[PDB]
Amino acid sequence: EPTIYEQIGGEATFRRIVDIFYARVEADPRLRHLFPADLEPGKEHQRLFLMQYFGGPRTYSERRGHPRLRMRHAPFPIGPRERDAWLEHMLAALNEAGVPEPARSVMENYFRHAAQAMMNR
Amino acid sequence: EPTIYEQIGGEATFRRIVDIFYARVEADPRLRHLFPADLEPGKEHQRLFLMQYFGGPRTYSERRGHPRLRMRHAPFPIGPRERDAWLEHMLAALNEAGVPEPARSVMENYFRHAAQAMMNR
Ligand code: HEM
Ligand code: HEM
């Protein structure tokens, strides 16, 4: 059976999601300060991670090793404020990119869980 | 063409914007300390400025002369953190006050530039 990666149109669709997400992050003074001056490497890492998580190429683990996202987010103070902002933008990206059901629901479910689990304050 | 002021509903809309903005300022320790004990005179001055800038009455100039905003903000140490806090609350105020597009975007564009250019430390 098709992976979600396949269900939603593969790499091109993840590119679109991450583009919308990062545009919103860049424009959000609640969040911009946490990110580097050069956003591009992180934007690439996020695209590759999502592609991998949802059944696509394992390019992410080739570049970056194990995700260990909770450890990677430890340097950023993340409370409900940051969580809510992040989720707002990623769900808007999902919805704006036209991801079809049922995959869109799986992705939302994952993000709601993962955003909560990333909080550290 | 009609002014932004007219497009967004005039004085009444700016009152809503500034009320929401100042409520947020008062509740934000990043900013509150910069403002005087009595916020009301400055609140009215800010409302009149916005009204004038976006094409409404020239009441601001009658009361305060030229805006000279960078000069007037010199007494306040304003860096990236203060910029970010101000912009967060003003952008939220535009959204919560119901400012329609495309006018809202013009106002956002102006604020993003002005907030950056106000920094002095
Ligand atoms: C579902 C929740 C989240 C997921 C799936 C996610 C995913 C990722 C991934 C894959 C990376 C790149 C890791 C790497 O360097 O290989 C990353 C980095 C980052 N994330 Fe998240 N994240 C989430 C939540 C958050 C939240 C809540 C915040 C802050 C509000 C945040 C801010 C950051 C920042 C600042 C970076 C560093 C970016 C860079 O190095 O350029 N993330 N995230
Ligand atoms: C787009 C950026 C900004 C605009 C358009 C703006 C506009 C104004 C205006 C029109 C006034 C009243 C001027 C007068 O006295 O006649 C004012 C005062 C003031 N502004 Fe701003 N401002 C901006 C950025 C900031 C920032 C970044 C801060 C601090 C983070 C700040 C803090 C203050 C304070 C403390 C006052 C004095 C208020 C009072 O005297 O009651 N402003 N601003």
- In chain A, where the domains are located: 1-121
> Tokens 């949802």 label which residue?
A54
Ligand 2 atom with minimal separation from the B83 CA: 27
Distances (CA, A) of A56 to A11, A108, B11, B79: 8, 18, 54, 43
| Gap from A38 CA to chain B (nearest CA, Å) | 17
Resolution expressed in Å: 1.7
SS3 of A38-94: CCHHHHHHHHHHHHHHCCCCCHHHHHHCCCCHHHHCCCCCCCHHHHHHHHHHHHHHH
Between the CA of B74 and the centroid of ligand 2 the distance, in Å, is: 10
> Which residue's CA lies nearest to atom 11 of ligand 2?
B46
Handedness of CA A71, A72, A77, A80 (dihedral sign): negative
Per the CATH hierarchy, to which homologous superfamily does domain B1-121 belong?
Globins (1.10.490.10)
Ligand at shortest distance from the CA of B21: 2
DSSP string covering B53-121? HTTS--HHHHHHSS--HHHHTTTS---HHHHHHHHHHHHHHHHHTTPPTTHHHHHHHHHHHHHHHT---
- Tokens representing A105 are 């629901």
Contact residues, chain A, for B80 at CB < 8 Å: 33
CA triplet A56, A59, A65: central angle to 5 degrees? 120
Structure tokens at A82: 């940051």
Which residue, judged by its Cα, is nearest atom 20 of ligand 2? B73
Compute the radius of gyration of chain A from its Cα atoms: 14
Tokens of B109: 């564009």
* DSSP state, residue B32: G
Give the integer Cα–Cα distance in Å for B52 and B58. 5
